[PDB]
Amino acid sequence: FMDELVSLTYRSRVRLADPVADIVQIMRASRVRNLRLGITGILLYNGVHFVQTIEGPRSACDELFRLISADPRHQEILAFDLEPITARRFPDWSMRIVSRKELRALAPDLERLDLSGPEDVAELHRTIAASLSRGDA
Numbered sequence: 543f544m545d546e547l548v549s550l551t552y553r554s555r556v557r558l559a560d561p562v563a564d565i566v567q568i569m570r571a572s573r574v575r576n577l578r579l580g581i582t583g584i585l586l587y588n589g590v591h592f593v594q595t596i597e598g599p600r601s602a603c604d605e606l607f608r609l610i611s612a613d614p615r616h617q618e619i620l621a622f623d624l625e626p627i628t629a630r631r632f633p634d635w636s637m638r639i640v641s642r643k644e645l646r647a648l649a650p651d652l653e654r655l656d657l658s659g660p661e662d663v664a665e666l667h668r669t670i671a672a673s674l675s676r677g678d679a
């Protein structure tokens with residue numbers, strides 16, 4: 543139970559004193575932590591909301607989400623879903639940040655990250671995974 547692979551995706555409101563400096567520290571932090579924990583995933587940032595997907599052992603996602611929810615640089619955190627999974631969707635990335643510009647190019651209709659559509663996360667996952675992947679092997 544504690545080991546099974548899961549994917550969690552949550553949406554939060556950005557609460558950044560300085561976006562570049564704040565996001566650099568988040569990526570720096572996460573690249574080392576996720577690697578150790580066995581987490582992989584993607585962070586979408588559009589200037590207003592973050593949408594984060596992390597995937598790994600159920601117990602490591604629980605732990606991480608706990609820490610991330612204690613982070614003052616975002617608010618109104620609410621999980622979209624938590625799903626057992628067969629295989630990682632973003633195995634190659636400890637945390638890949640996907641910022642405003644690239645989300646515009648990859649998923650023009652989802653740039654708002656409202657997640658009001660019932661297939662917005664699946665769509666984000668599909669188009670982002672696919673963009674990566676193309677560069678693989």
Ligand SMILES: Cc1cc2nc3c(=O)[nH]c(=O)nc-3n(C[C@H](O)[C@H](O)[C@H](O)COP(=O)(O)O)c2cc1C
Pocket residue numbers: 554568571572573575576585592594596606609610611612613614615616637
């Ligand atoms: C929206 C957002 C996403 C974050 N994602 C991660 C993450 O995926 N992995 C991680 O280790 N920390 C993440 N963090 C930062 C953590 O909250 C935590 O502060 C960090 O791991 C520890 O920084 P420190 O090692 O300097 O204390 C995120 C923070 C925010 C605001």
